[PDB]
């Protein structure tokens, strides 16, 4: 409702500015502490291929 | 900046909606705050400074414990003295029951 | 003596509420480090706690 | 007992860690500063009684 | 996996409904909510369903089965508060000013004011006589 409304937003920003103590060395913190960058030159020379050789892959 | 008359809160609660339910969330702190302002044995009436919710939710008590040191350890050693001076004289002594 | 000659070859070669009394220390041999001499204090200083007239 | 007091008493002094630097948000100041709360000065007793209740 | 032996195969499950008699607790004479707490085997053991979920000490072991033991008009409230206002105040500064201590006129201006809140509204000890009495004139 309108009331509760208001009432979650205010206490939203009341635990904001609580967590707001530390907010930015923790979110630095966090921020500071894959697959596909292994795969990435694959990836780059998959996409040279041209698309004769594509229909034309067998199955097993 | 407005301190409510004592009458106030106590009506409030003697009579007993997500605005009472936020409120509720905060009750480890009042629960600590209580048992932070809990009055020495050299005092009968502690009268401490109450923040509550307007719905009666939660009652917290904003206040510090602060102390001059060797005033409270002089205290605390007077404490020592009487409590070991009546020991000795009420060799009957009756603990309280609990609960 | 017996004890002086082990501990010299020893060097050389459920929720339980209240402490287990094997976590003790201070079971020692030598009676220097038992009959430890106590602080007079020059006879005016006193340990906190006890009762005075003790 | 007395060996295990300073066992905890050692620990602490020795696993001690500096107060983190920070900003000064205060939980209270913030609660008055909203309309939901206000002041008053009461008995403790009745202040127990009150938090007694409440968690009830 | 072996095949889960039915509550019929064992028989005699009769269909017991009391739930205890003399504080212990009466068993049930069919297997059927205890294969579905732990399934059977086809040679009767007791492979239990992994309970995968939040731990609850108390729950576990419940201390051995423990011990097994009218409101006012919206106008009526606001006319009455209104009355019970003094110029230039708002309702908590009129709670503020009776409450150095008529003690029935404090009484009832909190209780009304409490009543007001819990109508919904929780701006109530913020707003002067002149803002409820203009609310008051537009619902009139």
Known sequence: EKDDEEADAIYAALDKRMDERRKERREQREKEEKIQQQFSDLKRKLAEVTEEEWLSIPEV | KEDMPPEHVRKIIRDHKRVYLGALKYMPHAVLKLLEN????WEQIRDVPVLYHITGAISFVNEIPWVIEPVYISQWGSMWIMM???????????????? | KSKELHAIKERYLKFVFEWDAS?????????????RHQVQLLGRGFIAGIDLKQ | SYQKLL???????LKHRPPKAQKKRYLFRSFKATKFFQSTKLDWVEVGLQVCRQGY | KYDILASEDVEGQEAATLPSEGGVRITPFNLQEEMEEGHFDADGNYFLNRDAQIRDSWLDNIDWVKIRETSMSAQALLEGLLELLLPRETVA????????????????????????????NLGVYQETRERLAMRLKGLG
Do not use: C, W
């Open chain 2, 38 to 41: 809990m009055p020495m044995p």
């Open chain 2, 84 to 99: 070991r001076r009546e020991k000795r004289d009420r060799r009957h002594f009756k603990r309280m029951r609990f609960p």
């Open chain 3, 23 to 35: 976590e003790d220390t201070s079971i020692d041999y030598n009676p220097l480090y038992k009959e």
């Open chain 4, 7 to 13: 066992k905890y008493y050692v620990l602490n002094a």
């Open chain 5, 93 to 120: 500064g009129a709670l503020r000013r009776l409450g150095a201590r008529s003690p029935q006129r404090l009484d009832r201006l909190s209780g009304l004011a409490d009543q007001m809140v819990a109508r919904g």
